[PDB]
């Protein structure tokens, strides 16, 4: 183990501010008052969160808040493996954190910031998430590819655009996780981890996949 | 030609994000299918409008991030491109487009209206043309004159302007036509379904207004 | 007058086609399919239409599409006075026939593509289209500002998003005109020119203080 | 100190955007005043983030656009700024709300709840300061990491960014107490309205929030 590194502390220390400031600001938004009116509203809150933490600590920690993004990190040799486990330790940690005082602000048990499902299956949710979040790991890996000289445009604002886009199409099947650590802080805290799997397996192996077919095939 | 990594992989890149593009927009027609009011009808611009922003800023250094045969056309005409890529472009576009539309209608049921097909709201083909053409024409425009490498003055992000543009588009043209702007956007679901009414108005219209607009663009706009 | 310069030609051609693809897709946009729910809509076209025009055609003839805006080049000696009438002229003929069309595709008299009063004296539209055409004309010269090298960011959709601004702050009250060639195509398409001078005079002085305010004040 | 014209450019700046953010956020909090319905909830987040998305866009050479107390406390706590010069700033930040809070309540009724008032809705004051403080900490940590001089990565419009971290702070915020996340911004409705109701919730709230925003950005995140 012996981790160390004072530089390295900070990282794993952006990713815990950031992911409280991420789930507090999202979940407030999701519960603030029917809901498919409201998905617009909880799309550009939650895209606009990953637009300002990751323009505001990318430069500290690289601002993943989203285990699926760290894996996608990882699998693309980024990041090391003491780092990965530390980042998504710190983000799981703020997001229960946050959970806890959105949850203790709160109709009844209506909770849009809980993922659940809403006319599909666990199987077919597990690929809305997968492709959801595959599409969100691919922009974030291809936004920050140090080979490229074209990039002149806000890269946050693309990853929570990105962020944006996958809460458009995947909020009203499963509600949207494409964040495994964003889909287990309500969990803990209401207690209730039916059929949570599915905004784990889908999210991770959608990042995994993203960086294999960007690295190993794509763009090598 | 038909070797050099470089066309392949470019070819490839179409395929992967037509694919995502329709999903993710399909995705977002289905959902909530029922009433549409302005709320699903910007919600819609929106979620088809950021899929290019995304995917474009994820593909666009290996292949240009067309994902539109009319932007493919209008690439064409804009002599930027060989016909034996914009061949394997549209192929690779409707391919994916068909794929994801399978996908996304194999979570969503038959579908009555759907809305995630492009047809006709208060218009007739003459008008519905015209309609898809100018939402079209506003689009490769913008895709032309902002990839234009003799500018230094782009200094924004593009793939986001290009999403802009296909989101414009829909808020112009989703109440009259649902704006289809992409031929193969427009095949994929109408290929699952087997609905190919009015098809030809979505082919016409892109096509023609992506030429046109390479051609003020290039020959009467910003010469050479 | 002999005007001559080839170039100035595609700068007036630019501002006539821009023009009127600028007033097809926002009016089809606004007559699409009651009005305070639509009010979000019709911003975003409003404000996507320069943030996507300027983008396009601004290096060809710096994407005015606003009389306004025009005035506002002209104040501050940016323009000569024959290219700044050519491209006021432009953009009332591509207005007008854009119009045509959009009101020939044409619920009555609804129309919320008119601007009409709704709630305010034409005392106060004066006042509620001069700052709401200031602020726009203000972000169009201060972003133009040659001086400057911290822009590192879409000029046009800063642009935009002042016409967006603009049209969540005035579509309520006086239908958000702050464009005089906007404002006379629908008047001249319909005949009907009541209170069309309220978004005339409106609009002008508020580009023409933006100019003073900031060239002879804020940046000399 | 208070001589130099770049100070003195630099208040007058501060004055003239305040006076235009505020009245282009009120005229939007009115307008269609009565329910507060989603789509109201993100027009009035929309109308107050692209107020200080342009603004800030066309004032921000010559003052850096704080429009904002709390951002400008959060830049003395940077020492980027002097006592005096934050002082000046927070004066016509003030002078700026209440002028354009008096022309859009000249033009508006007196509004039963209006809310162009920052009041609470559903939360203990005990709770509306920690809503304030962390969607203020959220929005001055932005602009301090977005305006650190030392990063070479903000490719992007900051501007826009600000814009977008208010337009965030509203959608979070906005359900609970409003959003004020500026207490110039809550200070002039009230003053026009004479209504200060739960008012210190608004100053401590954002103050405190950017403070801490500043101290855990420079003294702890991104040191020297």
């Given at each position: 183990r012996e981790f160390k590194s004072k530089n390295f502390w900070?990282?794993?220390?952006?990713?815990?501010?950031?992911?409280?400031?991420?789930?507090?600001?999202?979940?407030?938004?999701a519960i603030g008052n029917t809901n498919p009116d409201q998905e617009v509203k909880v799309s550009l809150a939650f895209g606009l969160a990953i637009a300002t933490l990751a323009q505001?600590?990318?430069?500290?920690?690289?601002?993943?808040?989203?285990?699926?993004?760290?894996?996608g990190m990882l699998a693309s040799c980024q990041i090391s493996v003491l780092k990965?486990?530390?980042?998504?330790?710190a983000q799981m940690l703020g997001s229960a954190l946050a959970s806890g005082i959105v949850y203790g602000t709160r109709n009844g048990n209506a909770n849009?910031?809980?993922?659940?499902?809403?006319?599909?299956t666990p199987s077919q949710g597990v690929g809305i998430e997968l492709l959801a979040t595959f599409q969100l790991v691919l922009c974030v890996i291809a936004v920050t590819d140090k080979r490229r000289r074209?990039?002149?445009?806000?890269?946050?604002?693309?990853?929570?655009?990105?962020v944006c886009l996958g809460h458009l199409a995947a909020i009203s099947y499963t509600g949207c996780g494409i964040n495994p650590a964003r889909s287990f802080g309500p969990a803990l805290i209401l207690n209730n981890?039916?059929?949570?799997?599915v905004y784990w397996v889908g999210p991770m192996c959608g990042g995994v996949a993203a960086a294999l077919i960007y690295?190993?095939?794509?763009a090598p």
């Open positions: 900070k990282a794993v220390l952006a990713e815990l501010v950031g992911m409280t400031l991420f789930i507090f600001l999202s979940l407030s938004a505001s600590l990318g430069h500290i920690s690289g601002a993943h808040l989203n285990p699926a993004v760290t894996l990965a486990v530390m980042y998504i330790v849009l910031g809980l993922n659940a499902l809403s006319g599909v074209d990039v002149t445009g806000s890269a946050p604002l693309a990853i929570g655009l990105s981890f039916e059929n949570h799997w690295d190993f095939l794509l």
